[PDB]
Amino acid sequence: GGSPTSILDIRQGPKEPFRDYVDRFYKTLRAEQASQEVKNWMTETLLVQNANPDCKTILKALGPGATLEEMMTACQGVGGPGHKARVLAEAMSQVTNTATIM
Amino acid sequence: GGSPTSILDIRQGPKEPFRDYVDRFYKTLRAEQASQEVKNWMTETLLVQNANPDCKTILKALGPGATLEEMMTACQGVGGPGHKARVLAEAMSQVTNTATIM
Amino acid sequence: GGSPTSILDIRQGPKEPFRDYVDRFYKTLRAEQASQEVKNWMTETLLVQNANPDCKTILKALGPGATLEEMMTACQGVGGPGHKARVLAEAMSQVTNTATIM
Amino acid sequence: GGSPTSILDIRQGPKEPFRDYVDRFYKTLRAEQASQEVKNWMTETLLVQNANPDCKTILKALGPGATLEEMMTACQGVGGPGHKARVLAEAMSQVTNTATIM
Amino acid sequence: GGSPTSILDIRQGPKEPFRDYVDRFYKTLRAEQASQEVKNWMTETLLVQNANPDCKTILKALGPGATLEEMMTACQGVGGPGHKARVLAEAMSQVTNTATIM
Amino acid sequence: GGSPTSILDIRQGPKEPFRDYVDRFYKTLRAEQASQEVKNWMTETLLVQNANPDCKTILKALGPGATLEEMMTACQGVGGPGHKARVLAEAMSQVTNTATIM
Ligand SMILES: O=P(O)(O)O[C@H]1[C@H](OP(=O)(O)O)[C@@H](OP(=O)(O)O)[C@H](OP(=O)(O)O)[C@@H](OP(=O)(O)O)[C@H]1OP(=O)(O)O
Ligand SMILES: CC(C)(C)c1ccc([C@@H](Cn2cccc(C(F)(F)F)c2=O)NC2Cc3ccccc3C2)cc1
């Protein structure tokens, strides 16, 4: 309880990129004595959960566990104005154009 | 009054995701020398009251004080990018289609 | 007048949680010499008048001086997506659906 | 002459609150050796023209002559999630309902 | 390339007021051994190019050849909520009232 | 491989201006022992790929290979309010007016 660097608290800021935070999930796992597959609940899940919902709305479409070159190119969409370029419109199309409910 | 790290002032930074804040509610409790049940208002309900309403509006849907993993996945959208990806659009259609008041 | 933080101007950040600013307000209440009832204007009404329009606007809805526990909950909306979810939902439909003037 | 901050341009930030920058120019008039009365037209006029379009827009609305406590009271409307929260209902409604031009 | 503070890489933060940054541009211009006219490229067009698109768009409206106090006056609008109130609203009116395309 | 700051991972902060990050990519290119022609592929492509999608959507529009002055001028639009001033008008019109899908 209250244990840091175990990924149980690693976190990507709203404006913090997936790539940069990945270093926080990799590097903070360096501090953690684990197995490579063990780290996979992270690389795949806490990397997808605590990491900037842009990554959720992204890794949910792109998919999770996408290679570091894929989740990179994609989660590079993550970002304050960086995602506003793409996500801004998406929510705007989630309501009116593409995902308009009823 | 003004006692720190007792959960009474632990709060979800409105931008701090539900996790960043839960963690704070957890680890800082290590410092708070309390009873396990006492920590239960602190985990269930503080985590539901002074926790940035983004996680509250969710937490209710999830059920208040639901398991941390459960409130975590749902409230991971709490934090910036999620509530902006999703809730911007949700409330928007609450106003127009789903929740049109009168 | 203008003595350091006499309450007369204590400030809540546009995003600073009410509980937090309240920490500054209380902290500076200590700095100024006021009877408790005298501090009551300082708590009940200043807190409403000069504390981040996120709370002050609400504080009009709860009425000036709603018990700090009620107001704590009201002003717990203060925040980015936590506040803006509500403010967006209310303002967006005020203009179009709920309060469309003329 | 016109050395920095003599009430030449004492500028207010965008989110920097009115009481924060008002505290600065008062302090900066101290930086300027002028008549007490001189400082009066400096605090009433120059302050208003060069300070935060949020409080500059308010300052016009209150209209000059508003005692500082009254200025800051209206300018307490200033702020990102703070003024924006009031600007959603205030300005987002100018384009559509209140200030619909032609 | 990447020459320190040669104006070419001097920049205005997206939020940085026009002036705060101009203090930088100028402050280093004094350091860049240049002719007055040369400094005038830095003031007329670079000043614009490397300066916060809130205002970069403005300085065109103002158009080059305007006094620094002229651009500054128009650029007190520069700012997050400072500029959003006038310009976000302008954008709000760019979709609905005045700049409605097609 | 994937040595730090070898350009393979150089990145632009979402808010980090294009010009700023470009200084991180160029400077770090100095750290990268690469043929100039190689560096060119890094300046043309990699600069485009990991440099803040604000620019990615811009550089794509301008066309890859645009001169740094050309990428810069447009990417000076990169930024929070700075890119938002344009992008908000754009994405908003991508859903409703110009890019309305179906
Ligand atoms: O994206 P950045 O340049 O890093 O800064 C952003 C941006 O603030 P600006 O108005 O200065 O551009 C957000 O503004 P929005 O476009 O989302 O309105 C703001 O949002 P809020 O005013 O709603 O708080 C957000 O904060 P957040 O991520 O908490 O939503 C804040 O980021 P930082 O606080 O991390 O600097
Ligand atoms: C209500 C609030 C929380 C403050 C909010 C809401 C929506 C957004 C983004 C979209 N959006 C959606 C998901 C993720 C991103 C992220 F940044 F994380 F990448 C993103 O940009 N659009 C608005 C931003 C803004 C500011 C003032 C004027 C207009 C707009 C449009 C940003 C913040």
Side-chain angles (χ1 to χ4, degrees), chain A residues 1 5-6 10 23 75 80 82 86:
Chain A
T5 58
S6 298
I10 195 58
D23 288 347
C75 310
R86 201 229 301 177

Coordinates of all heavy atoms in Angstrom, one line a residue, chain A residues 1 5-6 10 23 75 80 82 86:
Chain A
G1 N 0.9 -1.2 0.0 CA 0.0 0.0 0.0 C 0.9 1.2 0.0 O 1.8 1.4 0.8
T5 N 6.6 3.4 -7.9 CA 7.4 2.7 -9.0 C 7.0 1.3 -9.4 O 7.6 0.7 -10.3 CB 8.9 2.8 -8.7 OG1 9.2 2.2 -7.5 CG2 9.3 4.3 -8.7
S6 N 6.0 0.7 -8.8 CA 5.5 -0.6 -9.1 C 4.5 -0.5 -10.3 O 3.9 -1.6 -10.5 CB 4.9 -1.2 -7.9 OG 5.9 -1.3 -6.9
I10 N 2.2 4.4 -11.7 CA 2.9 5.3 -12.7 C 1.8 6.1 -13.4 O 0.7 5.6 -13.6 CB 3.7 4.4 -13.6 CG1 4.8 5.2 -14.4 CG2 2.9 3.6 -14.6 CD1 5.8 6.0 -13.5
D23 N 8.4 6.0 -21.0 CA 9.7 5.9 -20.3 C 9.4 5.9 -18.8 O 10.1 5.2 -18.1 CB 10.6 7.1 -20.7 CG 11.1 7.0 -22.1 OD1 11.0 5.9 -22.7 OD2 11.7 7.9 -22.6
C75 N -0.2 7.1 -30.4 CA -0.3 7.9 -29.2 C 0.5 9.2 -29.3 O 0.3 10.0 -28.4 CB 0.0 7.0 -28.0 SG -0.9 5.5 -28.1
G80 N -1.9 18.2 -25.5 CA -2.9 19.2 -25.4 C -3.4 19.7 -26.8 O -4.3 19.1 -27.4
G82 N -1.7 19.0 -29.3 CA -1.2 17.9 -30.1 C -2.4 17.0 -30.4 O -2.5 16.5 -31.6
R86 N -6.6 16.3 -33.9 CA -7.4 15.2 -34.2 C -8.7 14.9 -33.4 O -9.8 14.6 -33.9 CB -6.6 13.9 -34.3 CG -7.3 12.8 -35.1 CD -7.3 11.5 -34.3 NE -5.9 11.1 -34.0 CZ -5.6 10.0 -33.3 NH1 -6.6 9.2 -32.8 NH2 -4.4 9.7 -33.0

